[PDB]
Ligand binder design. Structure first.
Ligand SMILES: c1ccc2[nH]c([C@H]3CCNC3)nc2c1
Ligand SMILES: c1ccc2[nH]c([C@H]3CCNC3)nc2c1
Ligand SMILES: c1ccc2[nH]c([C@H]3CCNC3)nc2c1
Ligand SMILES: c1ccc2[nH]c([C@H]3CCNC3)nc2c1
Length: 337
Protein backbone atom coordinates (compact mmCIF):
# COMPACT_ATOMS: atom_id res chain seq x y z
CA UNK A 1 0.00 0.00 0.00
CA UNK A 2 1.15 3.50 -0.74
CA UNK A 3 0.77 4.46 2.91
CA UNK A 4 3.37 1.85 3.88
CA UNK A 5 5.66 2.79 0.97
CA UNK A 6 5.37 6.45 1.98
CA UNK A 7 6.07 5.70 5.64
CA UNK A 8 9.25 3.82 4.75
CA UNK A 9 10.36 6.49 2.26
CA UNK A 10 10.04 9.18 4.90
CA UNK A 11 11.78 6.94 7.43
CA UNK A 12 14.74 6.58 5.05
CA UNK A 13 14.84 10.36 4.39
CA UNK A 14 15.05 11.15 8.09
CA UNK A 15 17.60 8.39 8.80
CA UNK A 16 19.89 9.57 5.97
CA UNK A 17 19.90 13.17 7.15
CA UNK A 18 21.28 12.11 10.56
CA UNK A 19 23.48 9.36 9.02
CA UNK A 20 25.24 11.93 6.84
CA UNK A 21 25.71 14.52 9.65
CA UNK A 22 25.96 12.61 12.96
CA UNK A 23 25.54 14.31 16.30
CA UNK A 24 28.67 14.31 18.51
CA UNK A 25 29.64 15.47 21.99
CA UNK A 26 26.16 16.29 23.28
CA UNK A 27 26.74 15.93 27.06
CA UNK A 28 29.58 15.22 29.50
CA UNK A 29 30.09 12.69 32.30
CA UNK A 30 29.88 15.37 35.06
CA UNK A 31 26.24 15.96 34.06
CA UNK A 32 25.20 12.53 35.48
CA UNK A 33 25.31 10.80 38.88
CA UNK A 34 26.20 7.06 38.82
CA UNK A 35 23.44 4.87 40.36
CA UNK A 36 24.00 1.14 39.61
CA UNK A 37 25.42 -1.35 37.11
CA UNK A 38 22.60 -2.88 35.01
CA UNK A 39 24.62 -5.25 32.81
CA UNK A 40 28.27 -6.06 32.04
CA UNK A 41 34.92 -4.18 26.85
CA UNK A 42 31.72 -2.52 28.21
CA UNK A 43 29.05 -2.12 30.89
CA UNK A 44 25.62 -0.47 31.10
CA UNK A 45 24.85 1.73 34.14
CA UNK A 46 21.77 3.46 35.50
CA UNK A 47 22.53 7.19 35.83
CA UNK A 48 20.53 10.28 36.86
CA UNK A 49 20.91 13.63 35.10
CA UNK A 50 21.88 16.11 37.82
CA UNK A 51 19.89 19.10 36.49
CA UNK A 52 16.64 17.45 35.36
CA UNK A 53 16.43 14.41 37.63
CA UNK A 54 15.77 12.21 34.60
CA UNK A 55 17.11 8.61 34.64
CA UNK A 56 19.02 7.12 31.71
CA UNK A 57 21.00 4.00 30.88
CA UNK A 58 24.65 4.75 30.02
CA UNK A 59 26.74 2.27 27.99
CA UNK A 60 30.47 2.74 28.73
CA UNK A 61 33.24 1.33 26.52
CA UNK A 62 36.96 1.35 27.36
CA UNK A 63 38.72 2.54 24.17
CA UNK A 64 41.84 0.50 24.77
CA UNK A 65 39.76 -2.70 25.08
CA UNK A 66 37.82 -1.90 21.91
CA UNK A 67 41.03 -1.57 19.92
CA UNK A 68 42.48 -4.77 21.45
CA UNK A 69 39.26 -6.68 20.79
CA UNK A 70 39.19 -5.39 17.16
CA UNK A 71 35.80 -3.74 17.62
CA UNK A 72 36.66 -0.24 16.33
CA UNK A 73 34.48 -0.36 13.20
CA UNK A 74 31.65 -2.10 15.12
CA UNK A 75 31.70 0.55 17.87
CA UNK A 76 31.58 3.36 15.31
CA UNK A 77 28.68 1.55 13.52
CA UNK A 78 26.73 1.25 16.79
CA UNK A 79 26.86 4.91 17.70
CA UNK A 80 26.33 6.24 14.14
CA UNK A 81 23.27 4.01 13.64
CA UNK A 82 21.75 4.68 17.07
CA UNK A 83 21.93 8.45 16.66
CA UNK A 84 20.15 8.17 13.31
CA UNK A 85 17.24 5.71 13.84
CA UNK A 86 13.76 6.46 15.27
CA UNK A 87 11.13 3.71 15.71
CA UNK A 88 8.68 2.82 18.51
CA UNK A 89 10.47 -0.45 19.40
CA UNK A 90 14.12 0.78 19.35
CA UNK A 91 15.78 2.20 22.48
CA UNK A 92 16.37 5.92 21.93
CA UNK A 93 19.90 7.39 22.15
CA UNK A 94 19.66 10.65 24.10
CA UNK A 95 23.34 11.76 24.29
CA UNK A 96 26.87 10.61 23.39
CA UNK A 97 30.39 11.76 24.23
CA UNK A 98 33.94 10.51 24.90
CA UNK A 99 36.82 11.31 27.23
CA UNK A 100 40.49 10.37 27.43
CA UNK A 101 39.71 6.71 28.25
CA UNK A 102 36.12 5.85 27.38
CA UNK A 103 33.21 6.15 24.95
CA UNK A 104 29.71 6.89 26.35
CA UNK A 105 26.23 6.30 24.87
CA UNK A 106 23.35 7.58 27.05
CA UNK A 107 20.04 5.91 26.19
CA UNK A 108 16.52 5.82 27.56
CA UNK A 109 16.26 3.68 30.71
CA UNK A 110 13.75 0.83 30.11
CA UNK A 111 12.80 -0.34 33.61
CA UNK A 112 11.09 -3.68 32.95
CA UNK A 113 14.32 -5.68 32.44
CA UNK A 114 15.44 -8.07 29.72
CA UNK A 115 12.94 -10.42 28.06
CA UNK A 116 15.39 -13.20 28.92
CA UNK A 117 14.70 -12.96 32.65
CA UNK A 118 10.90 -13.01 32.23
CA UNK A 119 11.14 -15.95 29.79
CA UNK A 120 13.30 -17.97 32.16
CA UNK A 121 11.09 -17.04 35.16
CA UNK A 122 7.86 -18.25 33.50
CA UNK A 123 9.44 -21.06 31.48
CA UNK A 124 7.92 -20.36 28.06
CA UNK A 125 5.53 -17.86 26.48
CA UNK A 126 2.26 -19.17 25.16
CA UNK A 127 1.83 -18.68 21.35
CA UNK A 128 -0.40 -15.56 21.59
CA UNK A 129 2.20 -13.89 23.80
CA UNK A 130 5.17 -15.02 21.69
CA UNK A 131 3.26 -13.70 18.62
CA UNK A 132 2.79 -10.24 20.20
CA UNK A 133 6.56 -9.91 20.77
CA UNK A 134 7.40 -11.44 17.35
CA UNK A 135 5.11 -8.95 15.58
CA UNK A 136 7.15 -6.08 17.07
CA UNK A 137 10.40 -7.64 15.81
CA UNK A 138 8.88 -8.13 12.31
CA UNK A 139 7.95 -4.43 12.14
CA UNK A 140 11.36 -3.37 13.55
CA UNK A 141 13.27 -5.46 10.96
CA UNK A 142 11.03 -4.13 8.15
CA UNK A 143 12.11 -0.62 9.24
CA UNK A 144 15.83 -1.44 9.69
CA UNK A 145 16.15 -3.44 6.49
CA UNK A 146 14.49 -0.61 4.51
CA UNK A 147 17.38 1.61 5.70
CA UNK A 148 19.87 -1.02 4.44
CA UNK A 149 20.67 -1.97 8.06
CA UNK A 150 21.32 -5.51 9.33
CA UNK A 151 20.89 -5.95 13.11
CA UNK A 152 22.86 -9.22 13.70
CA UNK A 153 22.29 -9.69 17.45
CA UNK A 154 18.69 -10.76 18.01
CA UNK A 155 18.26 -12.71 21.30
CA UNK A 156 16.10 -12.33 24.45
CA UNK A 157 18.86 -10.58 26.40
CA UNK A 158 18.80 -7.70 23.87
CA UNK A 159 15.02 -7.10 24.09
CA UNK A 160 13.96 -4.90 27.02
CA UNK A 161 10.36 -4.74 28.31
CA UNK A 162 8.95 -1.22 28.73
CA UNK A 163 6.36 0.21 31.15
CA UNK A 164 3.52 -0.73 28.75
CA UNK A 165 4.88 -4.29 28.21
CA UNK A 166 6.25 -3.58 24.72
CA UNK A 167 9.76 -4.44 23.44
CA UNK A 168 12.63 -1.99 23.08
CA UNK A 169 15.57 -3.42 21.10
CA UNK A 170 18.94 -2.52 22.57
CA UNK A 171 22.58 -3.25 21.78
CA UNK A 172 23.50 -2.24 18.25
CA UNK A 173 27.13 -3.32 18.65
CA UNK A 174 26.91 -5.66 15.63
CA UNK A 175 24.51 -3.57 13.53
CA UNK A 176 25.81 -2.42 10.13
CA UNK A 177 24.72 -0.50 7.03
CA UNK A 178 25.11 -2.95 4.11
CA UNK A 179 24.15 -2.38 0.46
CA UNK A 180 24.68 -5.93 -0.83
CA UNK A 181 26.53 -8.53 1.30
CA UNK A 182 28.80 -8.47 4.37
CA UNK A 183 31.31 -10.98 5.74
CA UNK A 184 32.14 -10.51 9.48
CA UNK A 185 31.92 -13.46 11.84
CA UNK A 186 29.87 -12.01 14.69
CA UNK A 187 26.76 -12.64 16.75
CA UNK A 188 25.80 -15.17 19.34
CA UNK A 189 26.33 -18.90 18.44
CA UNK A 190 22.81 -20.21 19.05
CA UNK A 191 21.41 -17.48 16.75
CA UNK A 192 23.83 -17.61 13.80
CA UNK A 193 22.48 -18.45 10.31
CA UNK A 194 24.29 -21.22 8.38
CA UNK A 195 25.79 -18.74 5.91
CA UNK A 196 27.62 -16.90 8.74
CA UNK A 197 29.00 -20.20 10.10
CA UNK A 198 30.17 -21.23 6.61
CA UNK A 199 32.05 -17.94 6.09
CA UNK A 200 29.93 -16.85 3.13
CA UNK A 201 28.90 -13.36 2.17
CA UNK A 202 25.50 -12.79 3.77
CA UNK A 203 22.68 -10.23 3.95
CA UNK A 204 19.47 -9.34 5.87
CA UNK A 205 18.28 -12.97 5.60
CA UNK A 206 20.44 -13.67 8.69
CA UNK A 207 18.06 -11.50 10.78
CA UNK A 208 15.04 -13.53 9.56
CA UNK A 209 16.84 -16.76 10.51
CA UNK A 210 17.50 -15.27 13.96
CA UNK A 211 13.77 -14.38 14.25
CA UNK A 212 13.04 -18.07 13.67
CA UNK A 213 15.41 -18.99 16.54
CA UNK A 214 13.84 -16.34 18.81
CA UNK A 215 10.24 -17.43 18.14
CA UNK A 216 11.20 -21.06 18.77
CA UNK A 217 12.95 -20.10 22.04
CA UNK A 218 10.00 -17.98 23.24
CA UNK A 219 7.41 -20.71 22.52
CA UNK A 220 9.49 -23.73 23.62
CA UNK A 221 11.50 -22.25 26.49
CA UNK A 222 14.85 -23.19 24.94
CA UNK A 223 16.47 -22.50 21.54
CA UNK A 224 16.40 -25.07 18.73
CA UNK A 225 20.20 -25.58 18.43
CA UNK A 226 22.29 -25.93 21.60
CA UNK A 227 25.34 -27.77 22.99
CA UNK A 228 28.32 -27.13 25.24
CA UNK A 229 30.80 -26.39 22.43
CA UNK A 230 30.14 -23.78 19.72
CA UNK A 231 31.37 -26.20 17.02
CA UNK A 232 28.65 -28.65 18.09
CA UNK A 233 25.99 -25.91 17.85
CA UNK A 234 27.25 -25.04 14.39
CA UNK A 235 27.00 -28.65 13.22
CA UNK A 236 23.33 -28.72 14.28
CA UNK A 237 22.62 -25.34 12.60
CA UNK A 238 24.05 -26.37 9.25
CA UNK A 239 22.38 -29.83 9.24
CA UNK A 240 18.95 -28.70 8.13
CA UNK A 241 17.31 -30.58 11.05
CA UNK A 242 14.99 -29.09 13.68
CA UNK A 243 12.64 -30.93 16.07
CA UNK A 244 9.53 -29.20 17.32
CA UNK A 245 7.69 -29.71 20.63
CA UNK A 246 4.41 -31.50 20.07
CA UNK A 247 2.53 -28.56 21.61
CA UNK A 248 3.58 -26.23 18.79
CA UNK A 249 0.64 -25.40 16.51
CA UNK A 250 0.83 -26.58 12.91
CA UNK A 251 0.93 -22.95 11.75
CA UNK A 252 3.91 -22.20 14.04
CA UNK A 253 5.84 -25.23 12.74
CA UNK A 254 5.17 -24.12 9.18
CA UNK A 255 6.41 -20.58 9.81
CA UNK A 256 9.53 -21.83 11.60
CA UNK A 257 10.45 -24.29 8.77
CA UNK A 258 10.41 -21.27 6.42
CA UNK A 259 12.41 -18.96 8.74
CA UNK A 260 14.87 -21.76 9.70
CA UNK A 261 15.47 -22.56 6.02
CA UNK A 262 19.16 -23.34 5.54
CA UNK A 263 19.18 -22.13 1.90
CA UNK A 264 19.07 -18.33 2.24
CA UNK A 265 17.57 -17.99 -1.27
CA UNK A 266 14.47 -19.87 -0.02
CA UNK A 267 14.10 -18.27 3.41
CA UNK A 268 11.06 -16.25 4.36
CA UNK A 269 11.85 -12.54 4.52
CA UNK A 270 14.36 -12.95 1.66
CA UNK A 271 11.95 -13.78 -1.21
CA UNK A 272 10.32 -11.55 -3.85
CA UNK A 273 7.54 -10.55 -1.42
CA UNK A 274 10.02 -9.70 1.40
CA UNK A 275 8.48 -9.15 4.83
CA UNK A 276 4.95 -9.68 3.50
CA UNK A 277 5.45 -13.46 3.30
CA UNK A 278 5.86 -13.33 7.10
CA UNK A 279 3.13 -10.77 7.85
CA UNK A 280 0.57 -12.74 5.73
CA UNK A 281 1.51 -16.15 7.16
CA UNK A 282 -1.38 -18.00 8.91
CA UNK A 283 0.45 -17.92 12.28
CA UNK A 284 -0.01 -14.12 12.24
CA UNK A 285 -3.68 -14.16 11.13
CA UNK A 286 -4.85 -12.63 14.44
CA UNK A 287 -2.20 -9.83 14.38
CA UNK A 288 -3.41 -6.25 13.81
CA UNK A 289 -0.14 -4.83 12.44
CA UNK A 290 -1.27 -1.18 12.67
CA UNK A 291 -2.59 -1.62 16.24
CA UNK A 292 0.77 -3.13 17.28
CA UNK A 293 2.72 -0.25 15.68
CA UNK A 294 0.39 2.28 17.41
CA UNK A 295 0.78 0.49 20.80
CA UNK A 296 -2.99 -0.05 21.08
CA UNK A 297 -2.86 -3.77 22.01
CA UNK A 298 -2.91 -4.85 25.66
CA UNK A 299 0.45 -6.47 26.32
CA UNK A 300 0.98 -10.04 27.71
CA UNK A 301 2.09 -8.51 31.00
CA UNK A 302 3.18 -5.26 32.56
CA UNK A 303 6.53 -5.47 34.42
CA UNK A 304 6.33 -4.83 38.15
CA UNK A 305 8.46 -1.87 39.26
CA UNK A 306 8.06 1.03 41.65
CA UNK A 307 9.20 4.05 39.65
CA UNK A 308 11.45 5.35 36.89
CA UNK A 309 14.61 4.62 38.91
CA UNK A 310 13.69 1.13 40.14
CA UNK A 311 16.30 -1.50 39.15
CA UNK A 312 14.56 -4.57 40.63
CA UNK A 313 14.06 -6.18 37.22
CA UNK A 314 17.84 -6.16 36.58
CA UNK A 315 20.37 -8.31 38.35
CA UNK A 316 23.28 -7.47 40.67
CA UNK A 317 26.87 -7.07 39.43
CA UNK A 318 30.13 -6.09 41.09
CA UNK A 319 30.35 -2.28 41.09
CA UNK A 320 33.66 -1.54 39.39
CA UNK A 321 35.50 1.71 38.95
CA UNK A 322 35.77 3.38 35.53
CA UNK A 323 39.28 3.87 34.13
CA UNK A 324 40.54 7.46 34.15
CA UNK A 325 43.67 8.58 32.35
CA UNK A 326 45.26 12.03 32.20
CA UNK A 327 46.33 11.28 28.59
CA UNK A 328 44.00 10.79 25.61
CA UNK A 329 43.92 7.19 24.30
CA UNK A 330 43.10 6.09 20.75
CA UNK A 331 42.22 9.60 19.62
CA UNK A 332 42.66 8.96 15.89
CA UNK A 333 40.71 5.70 15.94
CA UNK A 334 37.60 7.31 17.49
CA UNK A 335 37.76 10.77 15.87
CA UNK A 336 34.27 10.41 14.40
CA UNK A 337 32.61 9.24 17.64
C1 LIG B 1 28.32 6.80 35.44
C2 LIG B 1 29.53 6.24 35.74
C3 LIG B 1 30.54 6.99 36.29
C4 LIG B 1 30.31 8.30 36.53
N1 LIG B 1 31.18 9.25 37.07
C5 LIG B 1 30.45 10.42 37.10
C6 LIG B 1 30.86 11.77 37.54
C7 LIG B 1 31.48 11.85 38.94
C8 LIG B 1 32.33 13.10 38.84
N2 LIG B 1 32.63 13.30 37.40
C9 LIG B 1 31.94 12.29 36.59
N3 LIG B 1 29.14 10.21 36.56
C10 LIG B 1 29.09 8.84 36.20
C11 LIG B 1 28.07 8.12 35.66
C1 LIG C 1 6.84 6.77 17.17
C2 LIG C 1 7.94 6.93 16.40
C3 LIG C 1 9.19 6.81 16.93
C4 LIG C 1 9.27 6.60 18.26
N1 LIG C 1 10.42 6.47 19.09
C5 LIG C 1 9.89 6.22 20.42
C6 LIG C 1 10.74 6.02 21.61
C7 LIG C 1 9.98 5.63 22.90
C8 LIG C 1 10.26 4.17 23.06
N2 LIG C 1 11.59 3.97 22.43
C9 LIG C 1 11.70 4.87 21.30
N3 LIG C 1 8.50 6.21 20.36
C10 LIG C 1 8.17 6.44 19.04
C11 LIG C 1 6.95 6.53 18.50
C1 LIG D 1 18.77 0.40 28.65
C2 LIG D 1 18.51 -0.21 29.90
C3 LIG D 1 19.09 -1.42 30.23
C4 LIG D 1 19.91 -2.00 29.29
N1 LIG D 1 20.59 -3.22 29.29
C5 LIG D 1 21.31 -3.34 28.10
C6 LIG D 1 22.10 -4.47 27.58
C7 LIG D 1 23.04 -5.25 28.46
C8 LIG D 1 23.19 -6.53 27.66
N2 LIG D 1 21.86 -6.83 27.09
C9 LIG D 1 21.08 -5.58 27.23
N3 LIG D 1 21.02 -2.18 27.32
C10 LIG D 1 20.15 -1.37 28.10
C11 LIG D 1 19.60 -0.18 27.73
C1 LIG E 1 40.48 4.94 39.82
C2 LIG E 1 41.60 4.66 40.57
C3 LIG E 1 42.83 4.42 39.98
C4 LIG E 1 42.91 4.49 38.62
N1 LIG E 1 44.00 4.29 37.77
C5 LIG E 1 43.58 4.47 36.47
C6 LIG E 1 44.39 4.40 35.24
C7 LIG E 1 45.45 5.50 35.11
C8 LIG E 1 46.67 4.84 34.44
N2 LIG E 1 46.22 3.46 34.15
C9 LIG E 1 45.26 3.16 35.24
N3 LIG E 1 42.19 4.81 36.51
C10 LIG E 1 41.80 4.78 37.89
C11 LIG E 1 40.59 5.01 38.45
Amino acid sequence: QESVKEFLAKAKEEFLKKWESPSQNTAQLDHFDRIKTLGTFGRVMLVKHKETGNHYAMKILDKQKVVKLKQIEHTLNEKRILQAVNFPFLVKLEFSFKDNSNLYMVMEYVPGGEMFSHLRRIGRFSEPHARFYAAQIVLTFEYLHSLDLIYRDLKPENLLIDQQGYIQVTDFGFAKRVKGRTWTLCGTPEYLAPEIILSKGYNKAVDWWALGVLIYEMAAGYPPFFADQPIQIYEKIVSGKVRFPSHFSSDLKDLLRNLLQVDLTKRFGNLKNGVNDIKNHKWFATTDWIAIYQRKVEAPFIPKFKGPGDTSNFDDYEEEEIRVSINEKCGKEFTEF
